[PDB]
Tab-separated table of C-alpha atoms in Angstrom:
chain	number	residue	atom	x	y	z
A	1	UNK	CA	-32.453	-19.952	9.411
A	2	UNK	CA	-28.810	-20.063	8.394
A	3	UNK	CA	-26.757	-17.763	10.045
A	4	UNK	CA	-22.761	-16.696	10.774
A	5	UNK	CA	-22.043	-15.309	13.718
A	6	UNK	CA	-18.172	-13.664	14.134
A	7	UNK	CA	-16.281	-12.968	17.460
A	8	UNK	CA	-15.777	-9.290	18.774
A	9	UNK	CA	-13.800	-6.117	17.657
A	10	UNK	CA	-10.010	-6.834	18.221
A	11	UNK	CA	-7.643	-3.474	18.717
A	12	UNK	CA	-3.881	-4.586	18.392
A	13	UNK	CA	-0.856	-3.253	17.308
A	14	UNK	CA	1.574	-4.364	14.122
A	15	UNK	CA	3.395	-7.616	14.486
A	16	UNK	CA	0.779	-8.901	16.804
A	17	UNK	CA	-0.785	-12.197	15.661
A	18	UNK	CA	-4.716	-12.443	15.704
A	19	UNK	CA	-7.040	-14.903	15.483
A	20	UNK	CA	-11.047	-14.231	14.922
A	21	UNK	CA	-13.918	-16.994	14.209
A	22	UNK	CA	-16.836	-17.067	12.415
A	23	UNK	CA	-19.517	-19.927	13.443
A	24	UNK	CA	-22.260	-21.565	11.587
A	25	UNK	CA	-25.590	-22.175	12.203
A	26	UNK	CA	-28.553	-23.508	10.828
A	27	UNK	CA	-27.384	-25.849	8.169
A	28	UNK	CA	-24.559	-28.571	7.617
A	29	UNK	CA	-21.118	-26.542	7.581
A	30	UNK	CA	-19.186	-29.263	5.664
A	31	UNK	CA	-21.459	-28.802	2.514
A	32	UNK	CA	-20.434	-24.763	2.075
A	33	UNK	CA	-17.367	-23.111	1.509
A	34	UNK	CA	-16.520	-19.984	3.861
A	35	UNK	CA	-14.594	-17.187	2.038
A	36	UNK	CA	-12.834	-14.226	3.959
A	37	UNK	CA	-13.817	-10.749	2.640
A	38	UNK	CA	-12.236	-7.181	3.872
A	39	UNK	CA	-13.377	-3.554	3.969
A	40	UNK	CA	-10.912	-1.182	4.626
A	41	UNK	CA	-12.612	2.039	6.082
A	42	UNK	CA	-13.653	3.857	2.632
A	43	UNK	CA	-12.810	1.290	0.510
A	44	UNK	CA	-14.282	-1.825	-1.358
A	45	UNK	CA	-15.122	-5.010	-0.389
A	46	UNK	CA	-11.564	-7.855	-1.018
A	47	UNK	CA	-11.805	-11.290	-1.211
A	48	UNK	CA	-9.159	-12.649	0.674
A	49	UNK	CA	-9.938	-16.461	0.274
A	50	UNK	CA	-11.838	-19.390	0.827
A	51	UNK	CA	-11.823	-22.757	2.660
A	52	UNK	CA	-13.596	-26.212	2.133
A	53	UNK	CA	-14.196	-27.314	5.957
A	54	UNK	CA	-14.536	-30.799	4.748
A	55	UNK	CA	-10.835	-31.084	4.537
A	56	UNK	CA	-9.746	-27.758	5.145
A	57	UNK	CA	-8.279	-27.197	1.331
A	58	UNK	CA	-7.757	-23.578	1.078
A	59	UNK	CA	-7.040	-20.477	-1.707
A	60	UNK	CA	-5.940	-17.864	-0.665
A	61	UNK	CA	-5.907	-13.944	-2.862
A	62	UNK	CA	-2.460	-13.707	-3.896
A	63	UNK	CA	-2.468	-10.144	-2.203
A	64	UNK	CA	-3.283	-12.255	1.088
A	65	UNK	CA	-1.300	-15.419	0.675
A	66	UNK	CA	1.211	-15.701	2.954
A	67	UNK	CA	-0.124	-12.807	5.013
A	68	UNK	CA	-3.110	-14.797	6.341
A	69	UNK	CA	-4.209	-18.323	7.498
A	70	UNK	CA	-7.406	-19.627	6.978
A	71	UNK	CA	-8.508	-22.481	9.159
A	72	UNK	CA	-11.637	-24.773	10.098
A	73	UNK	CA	-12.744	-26.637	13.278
A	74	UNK	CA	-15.737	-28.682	11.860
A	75	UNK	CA	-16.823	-30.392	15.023
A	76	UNK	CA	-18.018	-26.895	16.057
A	77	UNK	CA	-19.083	-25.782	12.602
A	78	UNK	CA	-16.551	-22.468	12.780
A	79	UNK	CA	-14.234	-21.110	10.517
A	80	UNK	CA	-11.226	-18.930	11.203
A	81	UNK	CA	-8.797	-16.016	10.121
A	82	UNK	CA	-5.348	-15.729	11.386
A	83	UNK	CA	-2.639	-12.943	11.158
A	84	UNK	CA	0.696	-13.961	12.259
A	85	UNK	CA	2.308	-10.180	12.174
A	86	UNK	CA	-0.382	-7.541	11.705
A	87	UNK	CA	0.506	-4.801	9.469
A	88	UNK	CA	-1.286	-1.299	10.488
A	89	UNK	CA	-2.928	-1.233	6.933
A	90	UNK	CA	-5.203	-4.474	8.042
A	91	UNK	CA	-7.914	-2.407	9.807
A	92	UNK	CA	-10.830	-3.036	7.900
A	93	UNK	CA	-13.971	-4.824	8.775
A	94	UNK	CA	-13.450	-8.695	8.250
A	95	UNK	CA	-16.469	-10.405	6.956
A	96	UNK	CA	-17.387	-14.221	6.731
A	97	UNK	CA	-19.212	-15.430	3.871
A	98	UNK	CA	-20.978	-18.681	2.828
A	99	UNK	CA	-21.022	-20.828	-0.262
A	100	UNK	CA	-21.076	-23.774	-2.415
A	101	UNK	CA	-20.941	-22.154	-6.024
A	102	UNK	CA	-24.473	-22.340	-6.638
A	103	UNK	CA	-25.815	-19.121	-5.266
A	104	UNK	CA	-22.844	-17.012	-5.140
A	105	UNK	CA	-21.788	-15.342	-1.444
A	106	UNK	CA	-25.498	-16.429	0.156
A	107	UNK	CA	-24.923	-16.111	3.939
A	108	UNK	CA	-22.910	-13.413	5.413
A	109	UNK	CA	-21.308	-12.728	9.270
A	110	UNK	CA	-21.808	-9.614	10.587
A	111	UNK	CA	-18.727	-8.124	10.476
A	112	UNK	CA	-15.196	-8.086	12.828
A	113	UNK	CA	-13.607	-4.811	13.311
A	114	UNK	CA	-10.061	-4.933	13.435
A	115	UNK	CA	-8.442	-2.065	14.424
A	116	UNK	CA	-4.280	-2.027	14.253
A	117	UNK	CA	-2.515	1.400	15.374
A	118	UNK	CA	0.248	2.886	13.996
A	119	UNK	CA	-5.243	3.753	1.293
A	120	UNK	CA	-7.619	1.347	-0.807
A	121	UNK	CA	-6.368	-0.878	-3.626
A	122	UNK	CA	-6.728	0.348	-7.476
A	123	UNK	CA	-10.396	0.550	-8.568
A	124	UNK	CA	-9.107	-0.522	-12.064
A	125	UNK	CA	-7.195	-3.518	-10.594
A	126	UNK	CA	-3.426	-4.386	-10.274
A	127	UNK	CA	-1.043	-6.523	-11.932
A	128	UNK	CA	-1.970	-9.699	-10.630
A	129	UNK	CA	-4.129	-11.093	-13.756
A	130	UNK	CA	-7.309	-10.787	-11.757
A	131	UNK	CA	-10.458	-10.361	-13.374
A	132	UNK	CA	-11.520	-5.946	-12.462
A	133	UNK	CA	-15.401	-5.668	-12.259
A	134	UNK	CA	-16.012	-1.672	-13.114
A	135	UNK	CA	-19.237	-0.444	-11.819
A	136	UNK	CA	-20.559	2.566	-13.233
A	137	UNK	CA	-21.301	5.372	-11.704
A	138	UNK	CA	-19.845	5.086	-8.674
A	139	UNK	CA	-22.306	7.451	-7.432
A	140	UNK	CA	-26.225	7.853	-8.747
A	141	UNK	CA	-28.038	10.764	-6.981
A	142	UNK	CA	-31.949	9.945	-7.668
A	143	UNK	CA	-35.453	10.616	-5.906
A	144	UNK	CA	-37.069	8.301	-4.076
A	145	UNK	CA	-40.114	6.788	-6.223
A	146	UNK	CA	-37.440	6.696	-9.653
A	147	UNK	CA	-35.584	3.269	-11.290
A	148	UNK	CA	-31.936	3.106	-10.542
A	149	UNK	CA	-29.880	1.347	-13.415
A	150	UNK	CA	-26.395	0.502	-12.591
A	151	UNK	CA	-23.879	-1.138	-14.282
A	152	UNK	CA	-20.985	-3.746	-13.977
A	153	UNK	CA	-18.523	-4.460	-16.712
A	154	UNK	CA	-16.314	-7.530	-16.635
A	155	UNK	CA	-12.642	-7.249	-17.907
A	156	UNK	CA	-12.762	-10.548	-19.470
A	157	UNK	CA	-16.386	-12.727	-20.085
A	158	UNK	CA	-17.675	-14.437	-17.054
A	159	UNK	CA	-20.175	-17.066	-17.114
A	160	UNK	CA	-23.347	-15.705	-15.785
A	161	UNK	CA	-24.270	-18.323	-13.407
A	162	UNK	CA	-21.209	-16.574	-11.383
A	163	UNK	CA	-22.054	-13.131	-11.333
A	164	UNK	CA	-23.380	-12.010	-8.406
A	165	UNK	CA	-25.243	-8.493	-6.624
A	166	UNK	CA	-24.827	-7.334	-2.550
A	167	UNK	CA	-26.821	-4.617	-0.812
A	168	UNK	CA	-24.762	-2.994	1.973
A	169	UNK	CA	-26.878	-0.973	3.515
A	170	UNK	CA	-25.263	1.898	5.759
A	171	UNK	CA	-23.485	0.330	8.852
A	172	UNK	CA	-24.386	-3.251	8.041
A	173	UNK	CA	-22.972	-6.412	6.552
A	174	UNK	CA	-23.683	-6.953	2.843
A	175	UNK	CA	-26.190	-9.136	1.264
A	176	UNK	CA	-26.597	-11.135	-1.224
A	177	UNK	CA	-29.839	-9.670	-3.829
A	178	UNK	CA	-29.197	-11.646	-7.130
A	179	UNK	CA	-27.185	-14.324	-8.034
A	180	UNK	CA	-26.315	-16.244	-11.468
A	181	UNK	CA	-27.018	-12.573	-12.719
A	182	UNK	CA	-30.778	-13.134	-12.996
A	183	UNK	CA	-31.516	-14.476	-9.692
A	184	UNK	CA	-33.311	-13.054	-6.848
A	185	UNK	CA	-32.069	-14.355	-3.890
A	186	UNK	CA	-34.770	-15.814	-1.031
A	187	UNK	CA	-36.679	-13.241	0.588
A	188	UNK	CA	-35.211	-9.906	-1.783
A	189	UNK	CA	-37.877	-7.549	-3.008
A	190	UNK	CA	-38.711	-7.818	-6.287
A	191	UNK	CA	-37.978	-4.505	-7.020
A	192	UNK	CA	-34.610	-6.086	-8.142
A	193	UNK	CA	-33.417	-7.279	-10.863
A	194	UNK	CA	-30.749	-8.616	-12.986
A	195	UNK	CA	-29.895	-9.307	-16.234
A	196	UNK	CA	-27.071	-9.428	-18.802
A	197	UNK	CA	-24.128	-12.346	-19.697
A	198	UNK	CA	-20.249	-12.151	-21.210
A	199	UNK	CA	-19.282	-8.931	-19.769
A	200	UNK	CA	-21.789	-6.415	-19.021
A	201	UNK	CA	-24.517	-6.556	-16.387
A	202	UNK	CA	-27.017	-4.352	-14.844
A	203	UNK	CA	-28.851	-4.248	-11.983
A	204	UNK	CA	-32.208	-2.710	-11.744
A	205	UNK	CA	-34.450	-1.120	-8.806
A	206	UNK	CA	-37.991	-0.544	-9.725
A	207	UNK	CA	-38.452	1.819	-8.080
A	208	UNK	CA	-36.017	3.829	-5.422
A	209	UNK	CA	-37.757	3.015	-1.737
A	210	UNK	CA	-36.610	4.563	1.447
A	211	UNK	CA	-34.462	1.602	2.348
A	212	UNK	CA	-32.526	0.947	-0.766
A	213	UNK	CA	-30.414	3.764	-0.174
A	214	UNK	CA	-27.042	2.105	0.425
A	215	UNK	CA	-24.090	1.006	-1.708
A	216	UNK	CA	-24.312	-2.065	-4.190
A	217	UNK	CA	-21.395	-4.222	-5.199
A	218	UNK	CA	-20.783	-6.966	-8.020
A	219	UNK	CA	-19.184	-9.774	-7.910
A	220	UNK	CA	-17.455	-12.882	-10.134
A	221	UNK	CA	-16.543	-15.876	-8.898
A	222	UNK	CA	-15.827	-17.561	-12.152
A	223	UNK	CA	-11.629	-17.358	-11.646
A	224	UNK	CA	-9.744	-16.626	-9.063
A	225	UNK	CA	-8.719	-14.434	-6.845
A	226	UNK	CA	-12.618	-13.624	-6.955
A	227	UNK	CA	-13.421	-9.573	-7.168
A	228	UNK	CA	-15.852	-7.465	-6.682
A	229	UNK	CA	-16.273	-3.862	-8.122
A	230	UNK	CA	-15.698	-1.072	-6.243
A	231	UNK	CA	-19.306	-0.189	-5.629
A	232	UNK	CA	-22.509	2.242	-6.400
A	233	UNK	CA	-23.589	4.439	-3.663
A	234	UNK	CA	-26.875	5.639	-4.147
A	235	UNK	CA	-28.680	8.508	-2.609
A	236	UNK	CA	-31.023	10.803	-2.274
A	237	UNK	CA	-31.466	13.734	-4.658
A	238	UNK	CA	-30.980	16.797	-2.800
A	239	UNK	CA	-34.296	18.747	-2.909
């Protein structure tokens, strides 16, 4: 089984410098690219950027760039994220993330906490150019048993083979459930599905079970930085 496994929780303070890993397993590091994603406590998942082990060619968000350094060691299969000066507003779960643009995000770490002593970016995107993925609603109250519909809008047309769905379930790392906005990916219920191409996509859910109660998020990788929308929570109806 592939996996990514990331070092422990990390408490500093700002200017420190920080280092944290994230090691492959299970398959041939040099072949997939390892991206850098954030989660700021209440906020969306950020792509911060992405590094080819096989030489160790690296882009970085242009939020991130010159903030961060991205790194590989691929004799031992691990990537790494590195903070020269902390700033108090990078405490966030850091999550590593596999891929070869075929299949989106497939593999994901389980999460780093970093906590710095001492709010989230615009949902409707900044003035950096980047593509804003707007997922509607941001919250869908339904029943257990019902079909969830939700929706992710594109602010310019992305090819669909680089659209991509994640489950984060409460208090875990995301997941990839479809890719190439029609794909399920290995082992995801078919309860799920995807469908759509230029700009608008939904995601569908058969039927609402007990464990797909959790937040969804989209994502493009078609241009860079890569996004993702700010997320769907869905829960329970009260009753």
């Amino acid at each position: 089984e592939v996996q990514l496994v990331q070092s422990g929780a990390e408490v500093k303070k700002p200017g420190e410098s920080l280092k944290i890993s994230c090691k492959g397993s299970g398959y041939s590091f040099t072949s997939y690219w390892i991206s850098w994603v954030r989660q700021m406590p209440g906020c969306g998942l950020e792509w911060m950027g992405i590094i080819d082990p096989s030489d160790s060619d690296t882009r970085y968000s242009p939020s991130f760039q010159g903030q961060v350094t991205i790194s590989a060691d691929k004799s031992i299969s691990t990537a790494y994220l590195q903070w020269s000066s902390l700033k108090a507003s990078d405490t966030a779960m850091y999550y590593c993330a596999r891929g070869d643009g075929s299949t989106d995000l497939d593999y994901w770490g389980q999460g780093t906490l970093v906590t710095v002593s001492s709010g989230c970016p615009p949902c409707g995107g900044g003035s950096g150019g980047e593509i804003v993925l707007t997922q509607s609603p941001g919250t869908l109250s339904l029943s257990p048993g019902e079909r969830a519909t939700l929706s992710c809008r594109a602010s310019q047309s992305v090819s669909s083979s680089y659209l991509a769905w994640y489950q984060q379930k409460p208090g875990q790392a995301p997941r990839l459930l479809i890719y190439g906005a029609s794909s399920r990916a290995t082992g995801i219920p078919d309860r799920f599905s995807g469908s759509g191409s230029g700009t608008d996509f939904t995601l569908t859910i058969s039927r609402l079970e007990p464990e797909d109660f959790a937040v969804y998020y989209c994502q493009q990788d078609y241009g860079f930085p890569w996004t993702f929308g700010c997320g769907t929570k869905v829960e329970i109806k009260g009753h």
